[PDB]
C-alpha cells in the first residue's frame, strides 16, 4: 500500500539506576515487517541475549513489536537500538538518553 520508515522508541523499564539491574526496551512500529532486523547495542556492539514480543499487525500490514534485554547501566556505558529495513539505505540508530 504505502512505504514508510519504521519509528523507534528507546527507554528503560524502571528509571535508570547505576549498578542496579533493569531492562532496556526498543519499541519499533511501521509498515511491512518484511524480515526486519532489530539489534540492541552496548557501546556500538550487538548485545547477544536480546528478546522480543510477538509481532502485532493490522489488515494493511502496519506493525508494532518490542525488543528488550536485561541490563545494569553504569557510568561510561551507552546504549542504542539499531534497525535494518528495506525502506532504509543505512541502518537507523537511536540513542538511549539516561
Amino acid at each position: 500500500m504505502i512505504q514508510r520508515t519504521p519509528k523507534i522508541q528507546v527507554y528503560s523499564r524502571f528509571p535508570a539506576e547505576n549498578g542496579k539491574s533493569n531492562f532496556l526496551n526498543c519499541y519499533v512500529s511501521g509498515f511491512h515487517p518484511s524480515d526486519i532486523e532489530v539489534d540492541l547495542l552496548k557501546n556500538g556492539e550487538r548485545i547477544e541475549k536480546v528478546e522480543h514480543s510477538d509481532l502485532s499487525f493490522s489488515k494493511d500490514w502496519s506493525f508494532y513489536l518490542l525488543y528488550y534485554t536485561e541490563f545494569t547501566p553504569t557510568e561510561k556505558d551507552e546504549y542504542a537500538c539499531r534497525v535494518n529495513h528495506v525502506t532504509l539505505s543505512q541502518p537507523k540508530i537511536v540513542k538511549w538518553d539516561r
Copy 2:
C-alpha cells in the same frame, strides 16, 4: 533463510456440533511472512470478521500465526483456509476435516 511454502492446519475450537456455536481455526506456519494474506472461506466465499493472534517468529524469520472466527457448523456449509504468499503461484486452499 529458506524459501518454503507455508503449512496450514484447519480445525475447530470445539468438536463440530451441528447448529451449536463454535470457532474455526487456521494455524499457519512457514518462513518469511512478507505481507502474507490469510482468509477463511464459507463455501468458497471470504468471511468478513476474521481475527488473528500476534505473529510469532524466531531469528531466521520462521513464523507461526493463528487465524480464527466464530461460526455455527451445518450439513450444507463447507469451510476452508486460503493462504496467499509470494512462494505460492496459486493460492493454497485447505479444506476443513469436519
Copy 3:
C-alpha cells in the same frame, strides 16, 4: 450430555527442519475431559517432559487443551500423540506427518 470420542491435531510449532530445534503440538478437543490422559510418543515411547496449557471448557463441558514439547526432528524418528479416554476402548494414536 452427549458422548463423543476426542479429536486430535498433531503439528509442529514451525515447519519441520531436520537437526534444528522445534516444538511438537497436540491439540485435543472433545466432551468431558474426565481425567483424560494425553502422551506424546517418540518411536512409540512416551516422551518424559511434556507440557500442557490450561484446559478450556464451556457450559456443556465441551473442552479443548494443548499438549506440547521441545524436540528436534530427525529423518528417522517418528512422532505421535496418544489419548486415553473413557469413550475409547483403545488408546487413540494419531501420527505426525511432514
Copy 4:
C-alpha cells in the same frame, strides 16, 4: 488416586463498597474436575452471566479454577458460591463474608 470435597474461596475483586461496581470471585480447587458445576448465587438464586478462567491441573488431576461476575453489592443482598461435584451429595454453598 484420592478423592476429596473441593475447596471454595469467596471474595470480592475490590473491597466492598455498597452501591459501587465490583466483581465477585469464587476460587475452587480439588481433585478430578469431573464435570464440576459452579454457580454464583444472588439471594440463593443462580446468577445468569457468570464467567470462568481456564481450568488448571497437574499430573494427578488436582485442579483449580476461578469463577467471577460483575456485581454491585447492597446491604440487603446475600451472595454465595455453590458447587456440585461427584464427592458431594448436597451442593456445597459458601456465603460471601463481606
Copy 5:
C-alpha cells in the same frame, strides 16, 4: 477519597496435601496501595523467595494484588500472610487454614 483496612485472603493453589509441592496465595485488596508491605510467614519467619502479580487499580485507587510462593506443606508448619499499611497501627497477620 475514603480509606479502610485492607482485606486479606490466604489459600493454597491446590488443596493441601502433606509432602506434595504446592503454592501459597495471599490476595490483598484495599484503598491507596501507598508502598504496601506484604510478607508470607513460615512459623513466624518471613519467607524470602516470594513473588507477586502486577498491582491492579481503578480510578479511585482501590487496588488488588496477589502474593505467592512455592512450598510443600507439612503437618506442623504454620503459614500466614502479614500486611503493613499506613491505616494499620499494628501489622495484621492472617493465618492459613486448610479446612
Copy 6:
C-alpha cells in the same frame, strides 16, 4: 528509599496516520506510585491503563493508552501528577 521525579514516554501504537485509527501510549516509570494521576490530553476521558508493575523497593512502571484518529492540527500530550512534582509534568507527542 529514594524520592525521584517520574519519567514519561509518549508514542503511538502504529505509525502516525492522518484520518486513520490508532492508539496513543503513555509509559510512566518512577519511585513510589502512591495515588499517581496520569492523564492524556487533547489540546480525554475513557483512557485505559495496564496493571502497575513494581519491584521490592517500590520502583514502578505503568502504561496508559487510548484509541484515537490523528489529523493535522491536533496536539496530544501526557500529564502526570506526583508528590515529587510541584507542577504537573506534561510531555508532548512529536509525531
